[PDB]
Write an enzyme that holds these catalytic residues in place. Structure first.
Site, PDB file in Angstrom:
ATOM      1  N   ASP A   1      -3.357   2.241  -5.943  1.00 16.38           N
ATOM      2  CA  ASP A   1      -2.250   2.217  -4.868  1.00 16.38           C
ATOM      3  C   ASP A   1      -2.096   0.816  -4.191  1.00 16.38           C
ATOM      4  O   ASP A   1      -1.472   1.090  -2.904  1.00 16.38           O
ATOM      5  CB  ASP A   1      -1.975   3.575  -4.005  1.00 16.38           C
ATOM      6  CG  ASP A   1      -3.228   3.552  -3.202  1.00 16.38           C
ATOM      7  OD1 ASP A   1      -4.025   2.618  -3.135  1.00 16.38           O
ATOM      8  OD2 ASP A   1      -3.397   4.651  -2.637  1.00 16.38           O
ATOM      9  N   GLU A   2      -2.978   0.003  -4.265  1.00 19.34           N
ATOM     10  CA  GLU A   2      -2.948  -1.172  -3.616  1.00 19.34           C
ATOM     11  C   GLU A   2      -2.839  -2.458  -4.053  1.00 19.34           C
ATOM     12  O   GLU A   2      -3.541  -2.624  -5.249  1.00 19.34           O
ATOM     13  CB  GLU A   2      -4.258  -1.226  -2.700  1.00 19.34           C
ATOM     14  CG  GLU A   2      -4.305  -0.274  -1.572  1.00 19.34           C
ATOM     15  CD  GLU A   2      -5.555  -0.275  -0.791  1.00 19.34           C
ATOM     16  OE1 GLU A   2      -6.433  -1.209  -0.827  1.00 19.34           O
ATOM     17  OE2 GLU A   2      -5.651   0.796   0.329  1.00 19.34           O
TER      18      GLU A   2
ATOM     19  N   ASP B   1       0.546  -1.184   0.117  1.00 18.52           N
ATOM     20  CA  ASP B   1      -0.044  -0.036  -0.037  1.00 18.52           C
ATOM     21  C   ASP B   1       0.909   1.181  -0.004  1.00 18.52           C
ATOM     22  O   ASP B   1       1.727   1.566   0.912  1.00 18.52           O
ATOM     23  CB  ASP B   1      -1.025   0.121   1.185  1.00 18.52           C
ATOM     24  CG  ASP B   1      -1.513   1.408   1.273  1.00 18.52           C
ATOM     25  OD1 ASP B   1      -0.791   2.242   1.534  1.00 18.52           O
ATOM     26  OD2 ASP B   1      -3.039   1.189   1.423  1.00 18.52           O
TER      27      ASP B   1
HETATM   28  N1  DCT Z   1     -12.923  10.966   1.682  1.00 22.67           N
HETATM   29  C1  DCT Z   1     -12.026  10.351   1.075  1.00 22.67           C
HETATM   30  C2  DCT Z   1     -11.497   9.379   1.678  1.00 22.67           C
HETATM   31  C3  DCT Z   1     -10.342   8.777   1.239  1.00 22.67           C
HETATM   32  N2  DCT Z   1     -10.128   9.046  -0.498  1.00 22.67           N
HETATM   33  C4  DCT Z   1      -8.994   8.319  -1.077  1.00 22.67           C
HETATM   34  C5  DCT Z   1      -7.778   9.164  -0.618  1.00 22.67           C
HETATM   35  C6  DCT Z   1      -6.871   8.038  -1.331  1.00 22.67           C
HETATM   36  C7  DCT Z   1      -7.659   6.799  -1.133  1.00 22.67           C
HETATM   37  C8  DCT Z   1      -6.826   5.975   0.290  1.00 22.67           C
HETATM   38  O1  DCT Z   1      -6.889   6.770   1.523  1.00 22.67           O
HETATM   39  P1  DCT Z   1      -5.867   6.013   2.440  1.00 22.67           P
HETATM   40  O2  DCT Z   1      -5.366   4.563   2.264  1.00 22.67           O
HETATM   41  O3  DCT Z   1      -6.511   6.310   3.796  1.00 22.67           O
HETATM   42  O4  DCT Z   1      -4.627   7.198   2.651  1.00 22.67           O
HETATM   43  P2  DCT Z   1      -3.732   7.178   1.346  1.00 22.67           P
HETATM   44  O5  DCT Z   1      -3.264   8.565   1.094  1.00 22.67           O
HETATM   45  O6  DCT Z   1      -4.025   6.374  -0.083  1.00 22.67           O
HETATM   46  O7  DCT Z   1      -2.323   6.738   2.066  1.00 22.67           O
HETATM   47  P3  DCT Z   1      -2.678   5.695   3.528  1.00 22.67           P
HETATM   48  O8  DCT Z   1      -3.126   4.246   3.114  1.00 22.67           O
HETATM   49  O9  DCT Z   1      -0.962   5.483   3.829  1.00 22.67           O
HETATM   50  O10 DCT Z   1      -3.139   6.532   4.415  1.00 22.67           O
HETATM   51  O11 DCT Z   1      -8.777   6.877  -0.520  1.00 22.67           O
HETATM   52  C9  DCT Z   1     -11.014   9.727  -1.023  1.00 22.67           C
HETATM   53  O12 DCT Z   1     -10.952  10.040  -2.221  1.00 22.67           O
HETATM   54  N3  DCT Z   1     -12.182  10.508  -0.425  1.00 22.67           N
HETATM   55 CA    CA Z   2      -2.547   4.188   0.357  1.00 23.25          CA
HETATM   56 CA    CA Z   3      -7.045   3.158   3.891  1.00 24.65          CA
END
Ligand code: DCT
Ligand code: CA
Ligand code: CA
Ligand code: CA
EC number: 2.7.7.7
Length: 342
Positions: A105-106, A7
DNA sequence: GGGGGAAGGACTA
DNA sequence: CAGAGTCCTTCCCCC
């Protein structure tokens, strides 16, 4: 079964950094400007430098500017992020043919036949990290374990720039000392809904009689949580295949006027078809987000593929059906295509 | 009593 | 203030 979850960290904001290192250290906020009122829009993602102060994905740009008025604000550039991702995804490809790309990204790796203990899984994951970093200057987070779900959880706890493993031992502990709300797939609506039932930890599900669970959170989810706590999560790592592609857009002002919406709807269509590659969809759904942020949608499936001209025609009828069967003003409108001819 | 398709909504990343 | 895609569920047609 030994799954290796990868991730990337705050991918969008990090990619902006790699392309513009001067941003390193300063809080970066990648957002989507809606174009309604100057700084209107939402925050797509931000680095930890901004996360530390509450600036996170989902909040209003304005709000973010009241918290971090001096932070750097960049418009989202999905296309760039997408290409960087592709390149990385290809690197992972070289560590296991059994790989499941869950998102931009996963990725889930099934290194079961690639490694034997967890000591190398860790090491293997170390190579993957030093690989991605060495080639794309992108730091990621690895979460190893016995199944996708726990692998993810491991990763969730180790981010950013981390790597955690979960011995069958700890798997046992977590099933007992982990808030079921930290369990993938369990959102606020199910989190609370569960709490009402007193369940605060994954294992607490083993108690409650079944029909009571698959009665307030649905059969499927009910089982999911059970099989998880009962330490029996199976689910293999299969190659995911895009089943739907589409685009939604925010209009400058809420409207109920068909002639005022069409232009937004068509732009959404042009973009979707572009993204459609060479895929021919048989079904098209027009999706609309109302003034009260409600989501309504009318679609249709054809016995043949859909031509762009037909998309234009059918999307307008569906939009009309929407305006007929509903009264509220529309705020966001878009389309989505599915059931691609194989 | 389900299979299959439409519309809702949960969660996601 | 509030910006892509998958799966599950409900309501309905139909065998
Ligand atoms: N209200 C939201 C919440 C999340 N996302 C998107 C942001 C990127 C994706 C993944 O979020 P996270 O995984 O929580 O954060 P990241 O930036 O992808 O990286 P991390 O996993 O390290 O937090 O979801 C979005 O578009 N709108
Ligand atoms: Ca991520
Ligand atoms: Ca997440
Ligand atoms: Ca949760």
């Amino acid at each position: 079964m030994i799954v290796l979850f990868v991730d990337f960290d705050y991918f969008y904001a990090q990619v902006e950094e790699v392309l513009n290192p001067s941003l390193k250290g300063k809080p970066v906020v990648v957002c989507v400007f809606s174009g309604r009122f100057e700084d209107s829009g939402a925050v797509a993602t931000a680095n930890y430098e901004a996360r530390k102060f509450g600036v996170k994905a989902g909040i209003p740009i304005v709000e973010a500017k009241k918290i971090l008025p001096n932070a750097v604000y960049l418009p989202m550039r999905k296309e760039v992020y997408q290409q960087v991702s592709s390149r990385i995804m290809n690197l992972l490809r070289e560590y296991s043919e059994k790989i499941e790309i869950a998102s931009i990204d996963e990725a889930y790796l099934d290194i079961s036949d690639k490694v034997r203990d967890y000591r190398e899984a860790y090491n293997l994951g170390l190579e993957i990290k030093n690989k991605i970093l060495e080639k794309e200057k992108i730091t990621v987070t690895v979460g190893i374990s016995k199944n996708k779900v726990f692998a993810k959880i491991a990763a969730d706890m180790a981010k950013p720039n981390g790597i955690k493993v979960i011995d069958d031992e700890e798997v046992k502990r977590l099933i007992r000392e982990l808030d079921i709300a930290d369990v993938p797939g369990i959102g606020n609506i199910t989190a609370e809904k569960l709490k009402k039932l007193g369940i605060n930890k994954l294992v607490d599900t083993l108690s409650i009689e079944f029909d009571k669970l698959k009665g307030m959170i649905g059969e499927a989810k009910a089982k999911y949580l059970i099989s998880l706590a009962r330490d029996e999560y199976n689910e293999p790592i299969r190659t995911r295949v895009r089943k739907s592609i589409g685009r939604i857009v925010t209009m400058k002002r809420n409207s109920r006027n068909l002639e005022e919406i069409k232009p937004y709807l068509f732009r959404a269509i042009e973009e979707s078809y572009y993204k459609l590659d060479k895929r021919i969809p048989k079904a098209i759904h027009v999706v609309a987000v109302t003034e009260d942020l409600d989501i309504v949608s009318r679609g249709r499936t054809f016995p043949h593929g859909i031509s762009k001209e037909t998309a234009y025609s059918e999307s307008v009828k569906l939009l009309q059906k929407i305006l007929e069967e509903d009264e509220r003003k529309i705020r966001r409108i878009g389309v989505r295509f599915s059931k691609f001819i194989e």
